[PDB]
Amino acid sequence: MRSYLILRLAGPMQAWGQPTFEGTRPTGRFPTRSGLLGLLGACLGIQRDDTSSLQALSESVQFAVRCDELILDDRRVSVTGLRDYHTVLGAREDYRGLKSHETIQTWREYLCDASFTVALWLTPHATMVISELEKAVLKPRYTPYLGRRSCPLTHPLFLGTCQASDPQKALLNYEPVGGDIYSEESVTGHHLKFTARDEPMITLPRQFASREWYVIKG
RNA sequence: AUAAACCGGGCUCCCUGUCGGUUGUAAUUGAUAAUGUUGAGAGUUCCCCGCGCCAGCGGGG
């Protein structure tokens, strides 16, 4: 009924953010909407000031994220976390001019042993088409990463392309099956939702608005 | 071009000094490896050269 694009986000370390104005940079357990929009953005070489392109992207695309557990030699490996005592010396003291602090400190959280399968699709008011997105994910223009730039991908961003009625149905065709799914679209049997502050307010730089995921447990 | 980007946790530091593991102790007694057997036959011994009366004879490997 609808055509989906299927991506895999997998690497030794990932980081998907939560509200902070502080030096500790938190992570949640799966990709944020903002972040996925950012990933696609990087693929479609969109500069940071290009509010038109950013808005087009945001209004065109929607995501569903599945949390894939890792299995090594027939054993399950749970997603764990990591805190990096991250230091900066010679950091700007102010936005104007060149005075700087001897040392500042930050704490940054990462996800270890995490892997995701993402399904994205187009909205009825789409400015784009899926062929574009596929081409981009296969040949990105800006460097693609998993949250932070220090976080490479260990598997091609492109997984596949297909067609179904649910996101759930779409994702069924792609191993590993069995993980939880967080979708921007409702799936009939399922009633639980999960609140986040993912949604980028493109008109207002680096500020995010509340939204809700639909949860499809496995 | 993702709470993103830009982005060291970083400098200094003997584990050091003393110390027998030592005295005593048969592995010891018994035990055929024994019966039986032509090495016969068969001139192939591979290469080069000389002489040949084509029976072979000789030189060198």
Curated annotation (Swiss-Prot):
The gene is casD. GO terms for cellular component: protein-containing complex. Coiled coil: none annotated. NCBIfam families: casD_Cas5e, CRISPR_cas5. Induction: Repressed by H-NS, activated by LeuO. Activated by the BaeSR two-component regulatory system, possibly due to envelope stress. Part of the casABCDE-ygbT-ygbF operon. It comes from Escherichia coli (strain K12). Part of the Cascade ribonucleoprotein complex, with stoichiometry CasA(1),CasB(2),CasC(6),CasD(1),CasE(1)-crRNA(1). Interacts directly with CasA and CasC. Stable subcomplexes of CasBCDE-crRNA and CasCDE-crRNA also form, both of which are able to bind target dsDNA, and at least CasCDE is able to form R-loops. CasCDE and CasCE complexes have endonuclease activity. Binding of target ssRNA or dsDNA causes a conformational change in the Cascade complex. Gene3D superfamilies: 3.30.70.2660. InterPro entries: CRISPR-assoc_prot_Cas5, CRISPR-assoc_prot_Cas5_N, CRISPR-assoc_prot_CasD. CRISPR (clustered regularly interspaced short palindromic repeat), is an adaptive immune system that provides protection against mobile genetic elements (viruses, transposable elements and conjugative plasmids). CRISPR clusters contain sequences complementary to antecedent mobile elements and target invading nucleic acids. CRISPR clusters are transcribed and processed into CRISPR RNA (crRNA). One of its GO terms (biological process) is CRISPR-cas system. This is CRISPR system Cascade subunit CasD. Keywords: Antiviral defense. GO terms for molecular function: DNA/RNA hybrid binding; RNA binding. Disruption phenotype: Loss of resistance to bacteriophage lambda infection, loss of plasmid silencing. Decreased levels of crRNA. Belongs to the CRISPR-associated protein Cas5 family. Subtype I-E/Ecoli subfamily.
